[PDB]
Amino acid sequence: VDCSEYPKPACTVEYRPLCGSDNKTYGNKCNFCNAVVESNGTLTLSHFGKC
Amino acid sequence: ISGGDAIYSSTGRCSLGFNVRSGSTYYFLTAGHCTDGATTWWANSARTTVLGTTSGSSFPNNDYGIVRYTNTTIPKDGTVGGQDITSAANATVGMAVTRRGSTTGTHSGSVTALNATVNYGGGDVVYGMIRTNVCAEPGDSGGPLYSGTRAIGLTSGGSGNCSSGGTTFFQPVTEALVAYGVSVY
């Protein structure tokens, strides 16, 4: 997953989970990448699927 | 199974929009971004209960898709959860609406604007969307937006969340019904 094309003003809301380094399950890549940007690049991907 | 219930494809999970029909052939509507690249749909995460197969998909530009039921025994309720749906209508600014999705359940709000353009990026732009102050989260895609017994739209996307509040855009259901020549029941 690459978040260079972010942030985005909106995300579709399908469920394909990713697990962030904050131990939070992100609903999809768009949600995850917007969070990475919001954290100013501190949040990273732990693994694919639920945490 | 009814509007708002979970539906699984080979890729992920979305929500059933509305159960519709054409003559004696039953289908269900959902988001186009969910039907895009999906063939078979199941009712459970174990993928043991088949629902049907994708018959149409329109995304981006629009955001709707239709799935033909192949499961002959599963109940196909013309409702959203327990809420009966009897007709479809056009959204209007200030209209009180309700959304049901497989992740967040039922949430209400109002229509704040019409004919909105939403850019999901990478060339995925959708037009003519209904803007609302209703929240939605991953898994809610394709779920119904209704107003009483009236079908209004299908959940497409937005920002924010149900805890802090958000903005969600919906595809007008009337356009989907017309494109496929189906009706709610």
From Swiss-Prot, chain A:
Glycosylation sites: 40
Domain Kazal-like intervals: 1-51
Cysteines joined through disulfide linkages: 3-33, 11-30, 19-51
Coiled-coil stretches: none
Transmembrane segments: none
Residues the record marks as site: Reactive bond 3 for chymotrypsin, elastase, proteases A and B, and subtilisin: 13-14
Subcellular location as annotated: Secreted
Domains (record comment): Avian ovomucoid consists of three homologous, tandem Kazal family inhibitory domains.
UniProt name for this protein: Ovomucoid
Organism: Meleagris gallopavo (Wild turkey)
From Swiss-Prot, chain B:
Catalytic residue positions: 33, 63, 141
GO molecular function: serine-type endopeptidase activity
GO biological process: proteolysis
Catalytic reaction list: Hydrolysis of proteins with trypsin-like specificity
Positions of disulphide bridges: 14-34, 135-162
Domain of life: Bacteria
Catalytic activity, EC: 3.4.21.81
Keywords, in A-Z order: Disulfide bond, Hydrolase, Protease, Serine protease, Signal, Zymogen
GO cellular component terms attached to this protein's record: extracellular region
EC category name: hydrolase
Protein family: Belongs to the peptidase S1 family.
Role played: Has a primary specificity for large aliphatic or aromatic amino acids.
Assembly and oligomerization: Monomer.
Protein name according to UniProt: Streptogrisin-B
Gene: sprB
Shown part of the complete sequence: 115 to 299 of 299
